[PDB]
Design a protein around this ligand. Structure first.
Ligand SMILES: CCCCC/C=C\C/C=C\C/C=C\C/C=C\CCCC(=O)O
Ligand SMILES: CCCCC/C=C\C/C=C\C/C=C\C/C=C\CCCC(=O)O
Lengths: 131, 131
């Protein structure tokens, strides 16, 4: 996934609060999340891919092998089971917890990196540009 | 309540989607509501006060006597029991349904009419100016 490697900064967000509402994020956490303009850093070392999100109030990091299910603690503190595969040139992530699931797709669009999150019909689109 | 009589147009809204989320309004209805820039029309005839909200997709109207509980069907289709009193120069409305309650205060601030809605700690502020 060489096309994803680098540091990206958030430029626009659409329906993110609605997505968080659907996932079940609390009011306070939703407000902090909506204020943050995180930087996403993606790197690859051998077969391990690392996706790091940095913001003044919270940094997250996940290192994984494409196709192998792993444990992830989300920014909003959910303990989920995640699997990320490379399909059609996009990184497709599925998070599962308490009988629920949500999909997060990270793809390239022109010179931008687009992240699309879907939870029960509600779709959020976040656009990132290179830092 | 002569200070309230007239036609008012929405100028600003703050935390309205969060308030609707707390009240339990569905995604589609929340999106339509957030797009509407309603006009509020208040009139008094004898001891009956009428508050009418007009928008391209939905008009609502309630006529009541201050201090007497009445039935109201909200824009989002809730069947509630409402009571409106005049306190400190403000119209204070309490809606009750299914063991829940929310407060809606309509007050004058300068030349503006401010509507504040509170549901379990979440507060929304909508400002109106004369049309
Ligand atoms: C990525 C989170 C940005 C905000 C961080 C601060 C607080 C987080 C609080 C709640 C976040 C809830 C869900 C976010 C999880 C995945 C979305 C990643 C979207 C992106 O990649 O943009
Ligand atoms: C007043 C509603 C404006 C939007 C109308 C269109 C659709 C309504 C759908 C859902 C509305 C849900 C709750 C609104 C009820 C009271 C808030 C009045 C606020 C104001 O006086 O602004």
């Amino acid at each position: 996934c060489d096309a994803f490697v680098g540091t990206w900064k958030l430029v626009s967000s659409e329906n993110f609060d609605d997505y968080m509402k659907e996932v079940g994020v609390g009011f306070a956490t939703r407000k902090v999340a909506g204020m943050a303009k995180p930087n996403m850093i993606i790197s690859v070392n051998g077969d391990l891919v690392t996706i790091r999100s940095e913001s003044t109030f919270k940094n997250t990091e996940i290192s994984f092998k494409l196709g192998v299910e792993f444990d992830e603690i989300t920014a909003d503190d959910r303990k989920v089971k995640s699997i990320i595969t490379l399909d059609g040139g996009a990184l497709v992530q599925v998070q599962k917890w308490d009988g629920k699931s949500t999909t997060i797709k990270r793809k390239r669009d022109g010179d931008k990196l687009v992240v699309e999150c879907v939870m029960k019909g509600v779709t959020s689109t976040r656009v990132y540009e290179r830092a």
